Design an enzyme around this catalytic site. Structure first.
Site, PDB file in Angstrom:
ATOM      1  N   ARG A 240      85.601  16.818  83.219  1.00 36.95           N
ATOM      2  CA  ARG A 240      85.337  18.088  83.897  1.00 36.95           C
ATOM      3  C   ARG A 240      85.453  19.278  82.954  1.00 36.95           C
ATOM      4  O   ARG A 240      86.449  19.425  82.248  1.00 36.95           O
ATOM      5  CB  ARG A 240      86.312  18.240  85.075  1.00 36.95           C
ATOM      6  CG  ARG A 240      86.233  19.540  85.875  1.00 36.95           C
ATOM      7  CD  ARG A 240      87.154  19.433  87.110  1.00 36.95           C
ATOM      8  NE  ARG A 240      87.237  20.666  87.894  1.00 36.95           N
ATOM      9  CZ  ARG A 240      88.163  21.607  87.728  1.00 36.95           C
ATOM     10  NH1 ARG A 240      89.108  21.470  86.807  1.00 36.95           N
ATOM     11  NH2 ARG A 240      88.139  22.701  88.481  1.00 36.95           N
TER      12      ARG A 240
ATOM     13  N   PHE B  87      86.698  28.805  80.759  1.00 38.46           N
ATOM     14  CA  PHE B  87      87.944  28.401  81.391  1.00 38.46           C
ATOM     15  C   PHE B  87      88.736  27.299  80.680  1.00 38.46           C
ATOM     16  O   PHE B  87      89.704  27.591  79.982  1.00 38.46           O
ATOM     17  CB  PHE B  87      87.673  28.003  82.844  1.00 38.46           C
ATOM     18  CG  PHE B  87      88.901  27.559  83.590  1.00 38.46           C
ATOM     19  CD1 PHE B  87      90.150  28.109  83.299  1.00 38.46           C
ATOM     20  CD2 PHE B  87      88.810  26.597  84.590  1.00 38.46           C
ATOM     21  CE1 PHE B  87      91.285  27.701  83.988  1.00 38.46           C
ATOM     22  CE2 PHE B  87      89.939  26.182  85.289  1.00 38.46           C
ATOM     23  CZ  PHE B  87      91.178  26.734  84.989  1.00 38.46           C
TER      24      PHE B  87
ATOM     25  N   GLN C 188      88.944  19.348  80.911  1.00 36.04           N
ATOM     26  CA  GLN C 188      89.922  18.419  81.453  1.00 36.04           C
ATOM     27  C   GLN C 188      89.571  16.945  81.240  1.00 36.04           C
ATOM     28  O   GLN C 188      88.418  16.546  81.348  1.00 36.04           O
ATOM     29  CB  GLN C 188      90.106  18.732  82.942  1.00 36.04           C
ATOM     30  CG  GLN C 188      90.702  17.633  83.799  1.00 36.04           C
ATOM     31  CD  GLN C 188      90.941  18.102  85.234  1.00 36.04           C
ATOM     32  OE1 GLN C 188      90.162  18.893  85.779  1.00 36.04           O
ATOM     33  NE2 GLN C 188      92.020  17.617  85.849  1.00 36.04           N
TER      34      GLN C 188
ATOM     35  N   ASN D  48      97.504  18.418  87.422  1.00 38.89           N
ATOM     36  CA  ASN D  48      98.260  17.742  88.464  1.00 38.89           C
ATOM     37  C   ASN D  48      97.639  17.950  89.841  1.00 38.89           C
ATOM     38  O   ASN D  48      96.516  18.438  89.959  1.00 38.89           O
ATOM     39  CB  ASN D  48      99.731  18.207  88.451  1.00 38.89           C
ATOM     40  CG  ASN D  48      99.902  19.682  88.796  1.00 38.89           C
ATOM     41  OD1 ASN D  48      99.389  20.162  89.804  1.00 38.89           O
ATOM     42  ND2 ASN D  48     100.654  20.402  87.966  1.00 38.89           N
TER      43      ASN D  48
ATOM     44  N   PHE E 259      94.598  19.357  80.406  1.00 38.02           N
ATOM     45  CA  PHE E 259      93.501  20.255  80.106  1.00 38.02           C
ATOM     46  C   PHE E 259      93.838  21.147  78.920  1.00 38.02           C
ATOM     47  O   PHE E 259      95.004  21.336  78.581  1.00 38.02           O
ATOM     48  CB  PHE E 259      93.134  21.108  81.329  1.00 38.02           C
ATOM     49  CG  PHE E 259      94.229  22.020  81.812  1.00 38.02           C
ATOM     50  CD1 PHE E 259      95.321  21.520  82.505  1.00 38.02           C
ATOM     51  CD2 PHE E 259      94.132  23.398  81.625  1.00 38.02           C
ATOM     52  CE1 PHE E 259      96.295  22.377  83.011  1.00 38.02           C
ATOM     53  CE2 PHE E 259      95.106  24.269  82.127  1.00 38.02           C
ATOM     54  CZ  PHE E 259      96.185  23.758  82.821  1.00 38.02           C
TER      55      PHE E 259
ATOM     56  N   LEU F   6      97.811  30.048  86.397  1.00 44.61           N
ATOM     57  CA  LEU F   6      98.249  28.658  86.345  1.00 44.61           C
ATOM     58  C   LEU F   6      99.737  28.577  85.992  1.00 44.61           C
ATOM     59  O   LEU F   6     100.370  27.530  86.166  1.00 44.61           O
ATOM     60  CB  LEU F   6      97.415  27.867  85.330  1.00 44.61           C
ATOM     61  CG  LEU F   6      95.911  27.781  85.630  1.00 44.61           C
ATOM     62  CD1 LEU F   6      95.225  26.889  84.595  1.00 44.61           C
ATOM     63  CD2 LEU F   6      95.687  27.232  87.042  1.00 44.61           C
TER      64      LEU F   6
ATOM     65  N   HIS G 128     101.589  24.707  86.400  1.00 43.07           N
ATOM     66  CA  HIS G 128     101.215  23.661  85.466  1.00 43.07           C
ATOM     67  C   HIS G 128     102.057  23.755  84.211  1.00 43.07           C
ATOM     68  O   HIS G 128     102.224  24.839  83.653  1.00 43.07           O
ATOM     69  CB  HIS G 128      99.739  23.808  85.125  1.00 43.07           C
ATOM     70  CG  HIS G 128      98.826  23.499  86.268  1.00 43.07           C
ATOM     71  ND1 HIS G 128      98.498  22.211  86.629  1.00 43.07           N
ATOM     72  CD2 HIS G 128      98.185  24.310  87.143  1.00 43.07           C
ATOM     73  CE1 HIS G 128      97.692  22.240  87.676  1.00 43.07           C
ATOM     74  NE2 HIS G 128      97.487  23.502  88.008  1.00 43.07           N
TER      75      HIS G 128
END
Lengths: 11, 177
Positions: B66, B71, B74, B113, B124, B133, B137
């Site tokens: 992904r 951004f 991942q 997660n 990521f 985030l 994370h």
């Protein structure tokens, strides 16, 4: 949108 | 804390078979010892087999399934390859260590997660500050070499679910002792 999940992906 | 205790790992990537370069990361074992140990053991795959998965605890061969422009990228799902799998070396998932490090800089490595204490193997690498985030994370490492490979991967053409059309494979990985 902008999240980083494992299973339930959101926008 | 000891910068001496910080280890280094790498991810050799291929895009549709073509060599794309190496990503070298510095893990912060002095700030996230449990998390970083997971990552390194997964790069070298020396932790054996998944207690639950059964498949080998090794990023080698897994992909970056992904990617989102501006951004992050991942990957790390070496049991499903779709983002619904993965497993830590500690057997199943493990808890969130103190959220000491933040996503206040680009190119930091973090754990993907699905809610509190759900760290598996999926991780990521951001290419921009992602403060939204923070505290959700765990940030364990940082890219010190090859951030261009990340940028290259991030802007790959993707389908409607943000999966790269091309196959982005971690053809090899391990530690830099």
């Amino acid at each position: 949108x902008l999240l980083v999940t494992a299973g339930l992906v959101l926008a | 804390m000891s910068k001496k205790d910080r280890r280094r790992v790498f991810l050799d990537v291929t895009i549709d078979g073509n060599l794309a370069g190496r990503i070298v990361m510095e893990l912060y074992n002095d700030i996230a010892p449990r998390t970083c140990n997971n990552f390194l053991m997964l790069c070298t795959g020396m932790a054996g087999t998944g207690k639950i998965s059964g498949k080998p605890l090794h990023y080698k061969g897994s992909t970056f399934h992904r990617v989102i422009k501006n951004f992050m990228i991942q990957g790390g799902d070496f049991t499903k390859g779709d983002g619904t799998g993965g497993e830590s070396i500690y057997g199943g998932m493990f808890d969130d260590e103190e959220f000491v490090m933040k996503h206040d800089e680009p190119f930091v490595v973090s754990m993907a997660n699905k809610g509190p204490n759900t760290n598996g193997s999926q991780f990521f690498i951001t290419t921009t500050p992602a403060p939204h985030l923070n505290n959700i994370h765990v940030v364990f490492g940082k890219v010190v070499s090859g951030q261009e490979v990340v940028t290259k991967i991030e802007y790959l053409k993707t389908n409607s679910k943000n999966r790269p059309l091309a196959d982005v494979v971690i053809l090899n990985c391990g530690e830099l002792v």
